[PDB]
Ligand SMILES: Nc1ccn([C@@H]2O[C@H](COP(=O)(O)OP(=O)(O)OC[C@H]3Oc4nc5nc(N)nc(O)c5nc4C(S)=C3S)[C@@H](O)[C@H]2O)c(=O)n1
């Protein structure tokens with residue numbers, strides 16, 4: 001060891017470090033400059049970017065031995081604080097460039113360094129800078145980030161003033177539909193926002209640090225676990241196994257469908273007799289530090305008997321395959337889909353035009369910049385309190401309580417920390433029971449943190465769909481029948497697997513009036529990573545095949561792909577694939593708005609193709625519902641305060657999409673008659689001991705269901721304040737009358753669950769999108785590049801423009817990674833952020849445009865619908881169609897990697 005004096009943010013600092021310490025750990029653990037985040041931990045995400053002696057570097061790959069004496073270091077805390085904000089922070093906030101905000105510090109530091117060298121960079125300049133510096137963002141779609149940089153540049157040049165680009169309160173007083181920054185913006189652009197890992201530095205002394213001892217084989221029987229050596233290791237307080245669990249040591253699927261072959265009780269908290277997938281946690285180590293715990297976990301020995309490994313749906317379907325879950329077939333669920341008349345006479349008729357095909361959607365990894373993390377402790381009332389990224393706190397409490405041997409809500413409390421994105425993986429419990437297990441055994445606060453390799457090998461994935469479907473149309477182009485078949489590879493754990501399978505009966509071919517449908521669905525258990533909901537939850541996987549086949553049918557009929565769609569879309573008379581009348585009929589109108597953009601891309605693409613680079617254009621229609629199937633309910637309370645302000649209590653979980661902006665905009669709008677201003681609406685959210693059951697932030701339901709519960713609770717407060725015949729009471733007069741201050745609100749969606757053949761009215765609101773893309777294909781290699789994206793959308797009235805804009809940009813970006821680069825197949829190649837193929841800035845076109853068709857929803861709060869999962873419904877189908885359109889190559893098996901595009905090239 002040696003002391004090194006280094007100047008941090010203008011001040012000298014003598015630090016007692018070890019030459020092998022990583023600059024990132026030093027800055028975090030010793031200087032508590034928590035704004036410097038550790039994402040991938042391998043220098044790919046740039047989330048740990050700091051400026052070291054004028055050079056922009058990634059602090060996670062810098063040894064202390066390589067850092068000079070008196071070296072100057074600049075972190076976000078050296079750029080601006082909440083009281084003395086930098087123009088770069090102001091632009092970020094005014095553009096809504098910070099969603100989950102986990103990559104914000106790295107992007108801002110990196111940007112500030114760019115401006116020191118170039119006061120007037122072009123958008124392209126900025127894009128290259130982030131590209132060269134590995135600044136990754138999984139939320140924004142990048143566009144907002146560049147928009148923010150360009151504005152801060154004009155301000156530093158003295159061309160625009162801060163007050164000039166900032167949101168100003170209208171004479172209206174209304175913030176519903178405005179571009180008002182989100183409540184959490186400031187905390188996020190300053191690096192004060194505390195994420196799970198950051199909290200580890202601020203916990204009490206006696207806090208313990210966990211490490212998991214994971215299985216490295218995919219399938220096996222457990223003959224024994226030897227904790228002996230790990231116990232003897234330095235710093236280890238205790239080592240737990242399945243023997244230390246008090247409850248059933250199982251996680252229930254809760255809502256497991258009645259006709260499922262299994263019972264939803266197969267997931268162990270800590271495996272006891274079998275290993276179902278690579279990553280499986282067989283023991284928990286408790287140490288005085290993370291480094292000490294991780295090091296002792298490797299020293300835990302397993303006595304196993306290797307069983308065959310079924311790494312795909314087909315394999316687990318082979319007739320000789322053994323049951324992964326003894327006493328339950330690997331195909332534990334069958335889904336029927338029957339609408340209209342029998343479809344066989346339509347396919348057997350030589351006079352119809354038939355198009356058939358087999359497609360495949362991959363096991364897409366969520367790739368959040370922040371790996372999983374959470375902590376827990378014993379309450380001052382004897383309750384186990386667990387903090388995590390859970391986006392369904394009430395649901396997860398119920399899913400884990402029995403296996404821990406606890407009772408909700410008397411022994412257990414769940415709290416959602418500030419989340420650095422989930423994109424769905426948190427609809428599933430990840431480490432909530434593990435932390436709870438540890439907390440109960442020791443009685444002390446425990447903090448569990450996953451490295452990026454665990455975020456990859458031990459969190460759910462999008463489940464791959466194998467689809468074989470076909471259309472039967474007449475010579476004029478009208479689709480008369482459709483037959484579909486799909487198989488969902490769900491890994492070993494069934495939570496929500498059957499529900500996902502039903503999603504196929506609802507969405508394959510959605511958006512078109514197809515009178516007769518016959519299909520068969522299937523949920524199959526495999527030994528690959530289990531399935532956790534992924535933004536789209538059934539839409540991206542169902543609509544990819546139907547939208548690609550649609551273009552294949554168009555070619556067989558000799559009709560334009562865009563015009564063909566325009567011909568079959570919903571119209572008065574048509575119903576969905578569940579037999580439900582669509583809540584709005586704006587499709588014809590959406591096609592009309594899209595048409596001008598389509599025909600221009602048609603000319604522009606032909607007029608720009610090179611002999612070495614062919615360019616093409618592709619379209620696709622995506623549809624998804626807002627809300628969970630059936631009578632989906634939400635709760636919320638509003639309480640009047642003495643100073644006349646209001647405190648809103650809800651459980652609108654935030655993945656970083658902007659649940660805060662949504663609660664505020666909805667409350668404010670509903671509280672109009674009382675004149676409440678935005679700064680007078682306090683928010684108490686996501687804590688089962690304080691906030692009501694609002695339901696999960698999944699299914700793109702929050703804005704509609706929860707929005708309505710918030711709306712309702714406000715209307716009750718308004719009525720509670722009514723002075724007999726004359727106006728309103730005051731917080732003062734209210735107290736005197738002994739009148740209640742808090743008002744509870746609830747709302748139930750007017751929908752009905754689907755029956756055994758997939759029919760019914762499962763969602764009250766839908767989200768519709770028309771995608772158009774211009775892709776360039778390098779004929780020589782097969783490397784495709786999305787050059788432009790236009791998206792016409794109908795999501796009802798907008799609650800917050802910055803939020804919805806940022807949601808569409810972000811959604812379209814993941815759409816590109818889904819089509820061109822992402823996957824979780826090879827356990828070693830796909831265990832790192834870059835390996836799995838997360839899109840870097842240059843992969844996303846700077847040229848993205850959005851057109852909104854604000855048709856209002858009868859059942860939405862103020863006529864609004866969801867937006868969450870809409871931008872990921874069919875943008876991948878569009879990219880794929882574009883590629884065929886460019887070079888004639890047709891890829892039905894995602895992702896369309898270069899060599900894959902090459903193979904398919906006629
Ligand atoms: N007409 C509308 C509709 C929605 N919104 C806003 O848009 C956001 C998304 O609303 P909604 O579609 O109702 O979805 P939820 O709040 O239920 O969020 C869940 C959704 O959010 C998504 N967006 C994400 N965005 C980010 N940055 N990170 C994630 O992990 C995200 N996870 C995905 C996934 S997956 C899901 S299911 C909310 O801030 C809402 O207030 C709006 O301003 N106006």
Ligand code: FES
Nearest residue numbers: 039041043046060
């Ligand atoms: S680049 Fe350092 S944590 Fe990712």
Ligand code: FES
Nearest residue numbers: 100101137138139
């Ligand atoms: S805002 Fe960039 S990763 Fe979430």
